[PDB]
Enzyme design. Structure first.
Site, short mmCIF file in Angstrom:
data_model
loop_
_atom_site.label_atom_id
_atom_site.label_comp_id
_atom_site.label_asym_id
_atom_site.label_seq_id
_atom_site.Cartn_x
_atom_site.Cartn_y
_atom_site.Cartn_z
N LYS A 76 0.82 -1.21 0.00
CA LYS A 76 0.00 0.00 0.00
C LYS A 76 0.86 1.27 0.00
O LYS A 76 2.02 1.23 0.39
CB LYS A 76 -0.99 0.00 1.17
CG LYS A 76 -0.34 -0.24 2.49
CD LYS A 76 -1.09 0.39 3.62
CE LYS A 76 -2.45 -0.25 3.78
NZ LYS A 76 -2.99 -0.02 5.15
N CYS A 134 -3.09 11.15 -7.44
CA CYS A 134 -3.33 12.05 -6.32
C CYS A 134 -3.53 13.52 -6.71
O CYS A 134 -2.96 14.00 -7.70
CB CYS A 134 -2.20 11.95 -5.31
SG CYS A 134 -2.17 10.39 -4.44
N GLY A 166 -6.60 -4.38 -13.25
CA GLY A 166 -7.95 -3.84 -13.41
C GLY A 166 -8.91 -4.96 -13.77
O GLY A 166 -8.95 -5.42 -14.90
N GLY A 167 -9.60 -5.49 -12.77
CA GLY A 167 -10.55 -6.55 -13.01
C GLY A 167 -10.00 -7.95 -13.23
O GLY A 167 -10.75 -8.81 -13.65
N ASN A 192 -5.21 2.60 -12.55
CA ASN A 192 -5.68 2.84 -11.20
C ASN A 192 -7.20 2.79 -11.41
O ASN A 192 -7.67 2.56 -12.51
CB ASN A 192 -5.26 4.22 -10.70
CG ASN A 192 -5.20 4.29 -9.18
OD1 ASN A 192 -6.02 3.71 -8.49
ND2 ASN A 192 -4.19 4.98 -8.66
N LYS A 225 2.21 4.71 -12.28
CA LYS A 225 0.88 4.15 -12.45
C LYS A 225 -0.05 5.16 -13.04
O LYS A 225 -0.36 6.18 -12.41
CB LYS A 225 0.27 3.66 -11.14
CG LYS A 225 -1.09 2.98 -11.40
CD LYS A 225 -1.87 2.60 -10.16
CE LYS A 225 -1.34 1.35 -9.58
NZ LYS A 225 -2.31 0.76 -8.62
N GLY A 279 -5.96 -7.02 -7.77
CA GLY A 279 -6.38 -6.30 -6.59
C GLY A 279 -7.60 -6.78 -5.85
O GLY A 279 -7.52 -7.54 -4.89
C1 LIG Z 1 -9.07 -1.00 -1.32
C2 LIG Z 1 -8.22 -0.42 -2.45
C3 LIG Z 1 -7.19 0.44 -2.13
C4 LIG Z 1 -6.32 0.84 -3.10
N1 LIG Z 1 -5.22 1.59 -2.77
C5 LIG Z 1 -4.27 1.93 -3.75
C6 LIG Z 1 -3.00 2.45 -3.28
O1 LIG Z 1 -2.57 2.52 -2.13
N2 LIG Z 1 -2.19 2.90 -4.27
C7 LIG Z 1 -2.36 2.68 -5.62
O2 LIG Z 1 -1.54 2.98 -6.47
N3 LIG Z 1 -3.50 1.97 -5.92
C8 LIG Z 1 -4.51 1.59 -5.08
N4 LIG Z 1 -5.59 0.83 -5.40
C9 LIG Z 1 -5.94 0.72 -6.68
C10 LIG Z 1 -5.22 -0.37 -7.36
O3 LIG Z 1 -4.26 -1.09 -6.72
C11 LIG Z 1 -5.59 -1.04 -8.62
O4 LIG Z 1 -5.15 -0.16 -9.61
C12 LIG Z 1 -6.93 -1.56 -8.84
O5 LIG Z 1 -7.99 -1.17 -8.06
C13 LIG Z 1 -7.35 -1.92 -10.19
O6 LIG Z 1 -7.24 -3.37 -10.13
P1 LIG Z 1 -8.36 -4.37 -9.45
O7 LIG Z 1 -9.58 -4.25 -10.32
O8 LIG Z 1 -7.69 -5.71 -9.59
O9 LIG Z 1 -8.54 -3.84 -8.08
C14 LIG Z 1 -6.54 0.49 -4.44
C15 LIG Z 1 -7.66 -0.25 -4.77
C16 LIG Z 1 -8.47 -0.78 -3.78
C17 LIG Z 1 -9.59 -1.74 -4.20
#
Ligand SMILES: Cc1cc2nc3c(=O)[nH]c(=O)nc-3n(C[C@@H](O)[C@H](O)[C@@H](O)COP(=O)(O)O)c2cc1C
Ligand SMILES: Cc1cc2nc3c(=O)[nH]c(=O)nc-3n(C[C@H](O)[C@H](O)[C@H](O)COP(=O)(O)OP(=O)(O)OC[C@H]3O[C@@H](n4cnc5c(N)ncnc54)[C@H](O)[C@@H]3O)c2cc1C
Ligand SMILES: Cc1cc2nc3c(=O)[nH]c(=O)nc-3n(C[C@H](O)[C@H](O)[C@H](O)COP(=O)(O)OP(=O)(O)OC[C@H]3O[C@@H](n4cnc5c(N)ncnc54)[C@H](O)[C@@H]3O)c2cc1C
Ligand SMILES: Cc1cc2nc3c(=O)[nH]c(=O)nc-3n(C[C@@H](O)[C@H](O)[C@@H](O)COP(=O)(O)O)c2cc1C
Ligand code: FES
Ligand code: FES
EC number: 1.3.1.14
Lengths: 309, 261, 309, 261
Positions: free
Chosen positions: A46, A133, A246-247, A195, A168, A268
């Site tokens: 994280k 951000c 992503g998914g 993201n 990212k 994720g």
């Molecule tokens: C609970 C949560 C917290 C996240 N925190 C971050 C983070 O600390 N930094 C970052 O770059 N991405 C963060 N992500 C976003 C991603 O790691 C990621 O790009 C993602 O959500 C897309 O892939 P997924 O569909 O497999 O989640 C977060 C996503 C979720 C679900």
């Protein structure tokens, strides 16, 4: 693991391409209870901010069709605690697991501070710049929405990082191509994307947004088609590798990420549904590769890269 | 193995207005020991990826079963889909999870107060069944909105050394009103208080027993991972400045006031 | 219908707020076989282009998690056929069903031609400008991605339309607010949103994009959170009404659209899963309203509009 | 009523390598009459919104059932989930749909050629059962990739006035090779040809019987609405410039060459 699944990316010598995505795996502590973390290719921990952050008020999550909304707000104990405790724990228990450090901040100076220090961690092999951000300096505009602004940040961070820098990308843009080229021109060693997108859910009884923060980040299988589109768009004009996410929920998704142009894949949201998702994907990858005539992920990467135009 | 399992539904019956009782059978029941732990159940619908956290109401060791009482929403909610499960159906479950109630840390001579309300009542059942095997006084103050929602009365009153009072907001059945009214009466100097109910009721209780050391509260939160990684279910430790408490790992149950672990 | 469900929008006196979305209902011919079209509040027929268009090569559709991809390419018989045949059929069979005409084109001159003629149809009560189209003049940039370009188009079309003009917004932008204000300043009577997001799916055996057109439009419940977010964002600074759409599948979704700021709701993709989705939503709306203390949609609109800041 | 229905699964058995036979029971079977119509089945998974178009292989009027033979994909496909359905399960179905085969428009003295391949074979079964009730010659040329995939042989050969030949690419069983080889032999001057199989085979057939008037081809397309509204399943009528044909409404079956209605 085995040769068929190995990928070499800048700073990353991965035993397999599966990496839990940032914010979905904490710092590995909780999921280590479930399985040997060494089974993973790497881990994107994280976000770390110069100073510790409590995050946003609750509720912080909401469910959507085939996805979820979250507005955690990047809660983390801060760089200090992360350097002295979190990272050391991983190095002490998993000396060989290379970790990717996710960096966030509200202004350029914050990103710089973290990038310059976090690389001292023996186990940190690469940095992932979270540019989604809000730039407090530029009125609140995310660094990932302006090519020149993102480029300025990447250059500054590159000049001070001791490990490779991955940036990212945000999918919330009109045209992602200019941002990608700009970041590559600025010195980035690779890219990760995407993201989350933005969403909102309302509570019918209260008539108010479910999340305290109103908007939240949308993730999960619902967004895979978008991720695939952007990755594919960016792979056409960038020479640095991309780690896709992503998914992704199964080995088929992973392979689809490869077809679009990804070199490795992060998972994720799927961890929340099934904490054993990564190991299962890793075990099933070879059956699937067999079925589709793929000798190795490494060969697949070159095949996909040359079948262009 | 010991963390996730495709459990079998032994039976499921609607025991109150849109409140179901599901009896599950599986090895996971073995790890169980503390009252107040919960299960993270997966919905049999691919478009609903998040698991629902449901407290354990009770379990039968010899039979290898556990029982959960849960309220359902409309046709678009996940619980509605769970309520449709017939005997033999498999439920992808995660658990036991969380920090349960501390029962193996107290005497056979103390006055015990257990207060609950609505869907916060079920975990309190196993708590009483656990305290019974030990010994002393217990006064269960159960509260409900209407009789249509009243649950578990037979099992609580079927307990020895248990005194039970039932309050009802509108749909009256017992002492009309909120459990708060029932708190005003209790003369005995209690040594421990265990609670679980609406955020409003929790505020009332903590407030009244402001300095009671053994004051246990079971909290609720919008959760995701359920194991402590995501930080979705967060709360403030002893005041804003301190550490952050995760309801899924540090809790569900926390020690005294608006929050202490 | 009944008073509780009625909404009056510019040019639109709807018996209820349910309107099948453009491209998902043809011209009403096929679905009339299934139920009395008069049950609907209105109908947004498929895009009309000055000249007829065959569309894109096949495959044109693909499934995604809780959504679908389509790359139809706006196939339609052209304005002439539409004026002499399609519209007359609806007027002859459903004289009282007000219809919303969706307009598309590759350049400003095309939009203008259609807008000036289509209003002659007695049954056409409003026009919906599909601005997600590539502006051939501006290198292929969608009119909906540049505020000044969209504004120029709206003004030109407004000067020539005989019925109210609704502009359909694209969600594929960095900031939708400037586009919305610009379009409102240009003369638009209302807005509809959102059109689809972009996605891609790959076929693992062939390693090629499933759709012949590669990218496609993503729609369905998967995108509802995005629609809700944008609608809500736009409702905060626009004084014209919005017809919402994107992932609506039941009466609960409809009501959620209202909470975000929509005045009426269009249903697209859900018709493909269940051709009776609209009538069912219409029948179930009142039970749901009862449950949530809503006397009428009309009152809900004002309540939501005043609970601002 | 007469367009969509929650049908009941009478039975479902795997009759070949990853090829299932599902027998459905319901009133919808009443509207059936032409061979070549299809059903649009909904997947019992909320994240898969699109219905799957599956041709009708046959139906039993008196029994009020219909049978479909379909191939399944891996665990992430919708058909895989259909194949998991037990007896009694309900299948949300849409149909009958499409323009079927024209059987009630021909004599008891003509030579009929029916050619099929793989999953295109099932609709051809009801076609033969329909032509049988009438009268003349029929030579069914069935083609498969391997014996592991060979389906319906017993029912086709169990037909009177039917001559059947089976070809197999690799996994040989009958005349080795593609149905094309089987076309070369057929001496009789056929008057009507009905087809359904791979796009490649359809190209071969149309090409050989280039000017045969009664040349019927059943097409396949990625579909969505299945009723004609969306224009997803589109094809070119007599050459590029003309009208566009929708496979779900104008078809599934079209008249001669690379496409004519
Ligand atoms: C609970 C949560 C917290 C996240 N925190 C971050 C983070 O600390 N930094 C970052 O770059 N991405 C963060 N992500 C976003 C991603 O790691 C990621 O790009 C993602 O959500 C897309 O892939 P997924 O569909 O497999 O989640 C977060 C996503 C979720 C679900
Ligand atoms: C530790 C813990 C223990 C619980 N134990 C019980 C119990 O024993 N019996 C019982 O009836 N209820 C219990 N609940 C509340 C129960 O979890 C929610 O009522 C339920 O998850 C709502 O899901 P849904 O099926 O309605 O889905 P939906 O309303 O569709 O919502 C989908 C998402 O919203 C979450 N969600 C919605 N409302 C709530 C809420 N009020 N609290 C938490 N999550 C919510 C769902 O869990 C899910 O992730 C507990 C909650 C927690 C945190
Ligand atoms: C008119 C018609 C009749 C058909 N009749 C039969 C039959 O009797 N028996 C049979 O076995 N097959 C038949 N098919 C082919 C069958 O529809 C596809 O093999 C099946 O829909 C693929 O779905 P899936 O469960 O694998 O899903 P997935 O692969 O997950 O794909 C999801 C989406 O892709 C569509 N899709 C994927 N591949 C195909 C394909 N090759 N053709 C059409 N749609 C596709 C699905 O229908 C769905 O909308 C027919 C097709 C058409 C157009
Ligand atoms: C098959 C299909 C074709 C579409 N064609 C158009 C069109 O002609 N014009 C237009 O403005 N929108 C078109 N839409 C997009 C929308 O009508 C609509 O904005 C929608 O997809 C979002 O809502 P939904 O999730 O309910 O589909 C099309 C969408 C689909 C699924
Ligand atoms: S639900 Fe993820 S940390 Fe509590
Ligand atoms: S599937 Fe929609 S027109 Fe054929």
């Amino acid at each position: 693991e085995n040769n068929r699944l190995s990928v070499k990316l800048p700073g990353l010598d991965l035993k397999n391409p599966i990496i839990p995505a940032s914010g979905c795996f904490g710092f590995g502590e909780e999921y280590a209870k479930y399985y040997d973390l060494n089974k993973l290719g790497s881990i994107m921990v994280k976000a770390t901010t110069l100073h510790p952050r409590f995050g946003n008020p609750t509720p912080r999550v909401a469910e959507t069709a085939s996805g979820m909304l979250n507005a955690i707000g990047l809660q983390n104990p801060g760089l200090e605690v992360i350097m002295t405790e979190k990272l050391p724990w991983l190095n002490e228990n998993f000396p060989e697991l290379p970790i990717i450090a996710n960096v966030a901040g509200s202004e350029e100076a914050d990103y710089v501070a973290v990038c310059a220090k976090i690389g001292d961690a023996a186990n940190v092999k690469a940095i992932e710049l979270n540019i989604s951000c809000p730039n407090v300096k530029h009125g609140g505009q995310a660094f990932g929405t302006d090519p020149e602004v993102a480029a300025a940040l990447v250059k500054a961070c590159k000049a001070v990082s001791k490990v490779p820098l991955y940036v990212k990308l945000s999918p919330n843009v009109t045209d992602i191509v200019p941002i990608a080229k700009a970041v590559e021109a600025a010195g980035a060693d690779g890219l990760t994307m995407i993201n989350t997108l933005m969403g909102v859910r309302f509570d019918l009884k209260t008539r108010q947004p479910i999340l305290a923060n109103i908007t939240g980040g949308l993730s999960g299988p619902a967004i895979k088609p978008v991720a695939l589109k952007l990755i594919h768009q960016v792979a056409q004009d960038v020479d640095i590798p991309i780690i896709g996410m992503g998914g992704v929920a199964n080995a088929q998704d992973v392979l689809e990420m490869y077809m679009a142009g990804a070199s490795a894949v992060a998972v994720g949201t799927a961890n929340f549904a099934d904490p054993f998702v990564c190991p299962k994907i890793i075990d099933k990858l070879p059956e699937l590769m067999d079925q589709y005539r793929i000798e190795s992920l490494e060969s697949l990467i070159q095949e996909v890269k040359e079948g262009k135009k | 193995s010991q963390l996730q399992e495709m459990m079998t539904v032994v039976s499921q019956r609607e025991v109150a207005y849109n409140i179901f009782e599901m009896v599950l059978k599986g090895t996971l029941v073995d790890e169980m020991d503390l009252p107040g732990q919960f299960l993270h159940l997966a919905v049999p619908n691919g478009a609903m990826l998040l698991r629902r956290p449901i407290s354990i109401s009770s379990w039968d060791k010899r039979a290898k079963t556990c029982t959960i009482l849960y309220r359902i929403g409309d046709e678009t909610t996940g619980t509605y889909k769970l309520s449709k499960l017939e005997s033999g159906a498999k439920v992808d479950v995660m658990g036991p999870l969380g920090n349960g109630f501390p029962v193996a840390e107290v005497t056979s001579t103390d006055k015990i107060l257990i207060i609950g309300g609505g869907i916060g009542v079920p975990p309190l059942y196993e708590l009483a069944k656990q305290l019974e095997k030990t010994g002393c006084q217990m006064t269960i103050l159960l509260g409900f909105a209407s009789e249509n929602v009243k649950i578990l009365e037979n099992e609580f009153s079927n307990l020895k050394n248990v005194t039970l009072k039932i309050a009802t907001d509108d749909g009256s059945y017992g002492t009309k009103g909120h459990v708060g009214m029932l708190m005003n009466e209790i003369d005995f100097e209690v040594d421990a208080l265990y609670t679980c109910g609406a955020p409003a009721m929790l505020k009332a209780v903590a407030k009244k027993y402001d300095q009671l050391e053994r004051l246990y509260i079971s909290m609720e939160s919008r959760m995701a991972c359920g194991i402590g990684a995501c930080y979705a279910c967060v709360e403030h430790d002893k005041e804003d400045e301190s550490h952050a408490l995760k309801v899924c790992e540090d809790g569900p149950v926390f020690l005294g006031k608006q929050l202490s672990l």
